[PDB]
Design a protein around this ligand. Structure first.
Ligand SMILES: *[C@@H]1O[C@H](CO)[C@@H](O[C@@H]2O[C@H](CO)[C@@H](O[C@@H]3O[C@H](CO[C@H]4O[C@H](CO)[C@@H](O)[C@H](O[C@H]5O[C@H](CO)[C@@H](O)[C@H](O)[C@@H]5O)[C@@H]4O)[C@@H](O)[C@H](O[C@H]4O[C@H](CO)[C@@H](O)[C@H](O)[C@@H]4O[C@H]4O[C@H](CO)[C@@H](O)[C@H](O)[C@@H]4O)[C@@H]3O)[C@H](O)[C@H]2NC(C)=O)[C@H](O)[C@H]1NC(C)=O
Ligand SMILES: *[C@@H]1O[C@H](CO)[C@@H](O[C@@H]2O[C@H](CO)[C@@H](O[C@@H]3O[C@H](CO[C@H]4O[C@H](CO)[C@@H](O)[C@H](O)[C@@H]4O)[C@@H](O)[C@H](O)[C@@H]3O)[C@H](O)[C@H]2NC(C)=O)[C@H](O)[C@H]1NC(C)=O
Ligand SMILES: CC(=O)N[C@@H]1[C@@H](O)[C@H](O)[C@@H](CO)O[C@H]1O
Lengths: 210, 49
């Protein structure tokens, strides 16, 4: 669902949101800072409300066949947030759900590689007929999550739950991945593994029963 | 003029200008339907209805 865009400090940003325009549009853009409330940036495309800098510009809604675009030039640290677009298309019915937001992130220091540690399910858990693999990921930047569980050759899609990444008073973010299986399944496959990719760099660590 | 069945034709001395448009930006789509024969159908409409 989320879409991330990396922009160096003081450079232009490109934000895509919404479907292709079928009629004359009235695009609305919103700013949702982390933890805060969504704040308005642009209404009726390039036109803005009081107290908004001119660095934010909206693509015109007169053309057809293109997607809306919020352009931010020379991004400051405060502009980094989540941005949603509200589409008012003449050909399309009323939209009550905003479009998939774009997560703008200023680099704000050098990229860090994830530190992964995989642990087998606890022996005490086998007595309770519950088996859980824990894949820990930390010391990574930016906060991009890539979960990949491979039981030997073939993966398992269901039974996996992961949380949102959050920083813990450091550049890094906190990612924890889990997997609920059965005791007879842990002894079924020869070895499990959880692969973690970050910005195109994959890290893999395996685990085997005893 | 007394008989209603006959129409009443009028001729103007000053022209009244009229502006007509079809605001829909249609498109032509030629789909071959026969050898040497081609049928022309309306395609996607660009812009506001
Ligand atoms: C009058 O009725 C006719 C039908 O009788 C309508 O014609 C239809 O119009 C719709 C669009 O309104 C067409 O859907 C589009 O089809 C595109 C072509 O897809 C095919 O080729 C591509 C590769 O070239 C393959 O990937 C596709 O395979 C897949 O799709 C099929 C189902 O069609 C699945 O079964 C397969 O599993 C594949 O998934 C096809 O072979 C297609 O590219 C296009 O996709 C865009 O829109 C979808 C919407 O969900 C997006 O998910 C997708 O990512 C594309 O996104 C566009 O827009 C975004 C911005 O939001 C851009 O960033 C993208 O780059 C892209 O521009 C869509 O699925 C349909 O094919 C067509 N059918 C016929 C027979 O004509 C008329 O529109 C209708 N007109 C009016 C006025 O009423
Ligand atoms: C009715 O709908 C028509 C489309 O079906 C409209 O035709 C469009 O008219 C505009 C100009 O008003 C053309 O724009 C020009 O395009 C050329 C070539 O485009 C090249 O670059 C663009 C990206 O900018 C790219 O998408 C193209 O593929 C080409 O690589 C430019 O050189 C011109 O500067 C100008 O941008 C459209 O191309 C043209 N559409 C088509 C499909 O030909 C028509 O204007 C509509 N009616 C009215 C009254 O506006
Ligand atoms: C409809 C009408 O006005 N018809 C009259 C006609 O009765 C008259 O005899 C003629 C004289 O020139 O002018 C015309």
């Amino acid at each position: 669902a989320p879409t991330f865009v990396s922009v160096a400090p003081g450079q232009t940003a490109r934000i895509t949101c919404g479907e292709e325009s079928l009629g004359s549009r009235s695009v609305i853009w919103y700013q949702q800072r982390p933890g805060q409330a969504p704040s308005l940036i642009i209404y009726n495309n390039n036109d803005r409300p009081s107290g908004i800098p001119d660095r934010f510009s909206g693509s015109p809604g007169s053309t057809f066949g293109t997607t809306a675009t919020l352009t931010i030039t020379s991004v400051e640290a405060g502009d980094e947030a989540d941005y949603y677009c509200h589409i008012w298309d003449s050909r399309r019915p009323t939209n009550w759900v905003f479009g998939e937001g774009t997560t703008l992130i200023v680099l704000s220091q050098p990229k860090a590689a994830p530190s992964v540690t995989l642990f087998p399910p606890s022996s005490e858990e086998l007595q309770a007929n519950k088996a859980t693999l824990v894949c820990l990921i930390s010391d990574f930047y930016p906060g991009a999550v890539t979960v990949a569980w491979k039981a030997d050759s073939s993966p398992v899609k269901a039974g996996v739950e992961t949380t949102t990444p959050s920083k813990q008073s450091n550049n890094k973010y906190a990612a924890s991945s889990y997997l609920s299986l059965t005791p007879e399944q842990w002894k079924s496959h020869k070895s499990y593994s959880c692969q973690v990719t970050h910005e195109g760099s994959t890290v893999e660590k395996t685990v085997a029963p005893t | 003029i007394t008989n209603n069945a006959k129409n009443i034709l009028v001729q103007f001395n000053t022209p009244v200008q009229i502006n007509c448009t079809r605001p829909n930006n249609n498109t032509r789509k030629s789909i071959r339907i026969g050898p040497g024969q081609a049928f022309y159908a309306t395609g996607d409409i660009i812009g506001d209805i």
